[PDB]
TrEMBL record:
The keyword Nuclease does not apply. Gene3D superfamilies: Delta-endotoxin CytB-like (3.40.198.10). The keyword Ligase does not apply. It comes from the Eukaryota. InterPro entries: CytB_endotoxin-like_sf (IPR035918), Endotoxin_CytB (IPR001615). Transmembrane segments: none annotated. This is Volvatoxin A2. Keywords: Sporulation. It comes from Volvariella volvacea. Pfam families: Bac_thur_toxin. One of its GO terms (biological process) is sporulation resulting in formation of a cellular spore. One of its GO terms (cellular component) is extracellular region.
Length: 191
């Protein structure tokens, strides 16, 4: 999948959540053998959505300049931003665990369709975009879907330099967080 699905939904809503994943996947842009989420395109599609089973709640973003810090500290900042803004959808502890485990297990998850690695030859650094979609219960025919992307950049030159990171590993890390909250109704189908 283009986004890693993370959800606590009853069976009757799973089909609709799958449609939300399908919907989001149409905005993945592949160029130069690299796949990145197309936020402008997706936001416009939501703005111009003439349906009746999908509603736009809010969209939050944060760009944090490079700071020398431990992986764990960085994950906590990401979790704080999302938890502060979407407390009804995310549990602080669990969210932090999910992000931390992803970035400390990149070697195994590298080939996943929801992660994209890249290097900047000039600056000699590198980055990973992590795409995750959280869905939780809102009638019980509604649920929240939080379309999320986390781009972490670090002063690591090669892809292999990301293997075996631990919560204590310190690097000059920068982060870009994007999260769009949707209210979806059972029966929703990707346009």
């Amino acid at each position: 999948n283009v986004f890693q699905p993370v959800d606590q939904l009853p069976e009757d809503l799973i089909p609709s959540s799958i449609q939300v994943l399908k919907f989001s996947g149409k905005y993945l842009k592949l160029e130069q053998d690299k796949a990145y989420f197309d936020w402008p395109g997706f936001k416009t599609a939501i703005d111009n959505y003439t349906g009746e089973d999908l509603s736009f709640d809010k969209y939050d973003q944060s760009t944090i300049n490079q700071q020398s810090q431990e992986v764990g500290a960085m994950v906590d900042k990401i979790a704080k931003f999302l938890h502060d803004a979407f407390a009804a959808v995310v549990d602080l502890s669990k969210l932090a665990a999910i992000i931390l485990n992803t970035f400390t297990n990149l070697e195994e998850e590298s080939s996943s369709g929801f992660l994209q690695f890249n290097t900047n030859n000039v600056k000699k650094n590198s980055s990973w975009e992590y795409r995750v979609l959280f869905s939780v219960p809102f009638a019980p025919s509604y649920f929240y879907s939080l379309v999320t992307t986390i781009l972490i950049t670090a002063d690591i030159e090669e892809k292999t330099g990301w293997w075996g990171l631990t919560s204590s590993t310190k690097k000059n890390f920068a982060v870009q967080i994007d999260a769009l909250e949707l209210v979806v109704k059972k029966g929703f189908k990707a346009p």
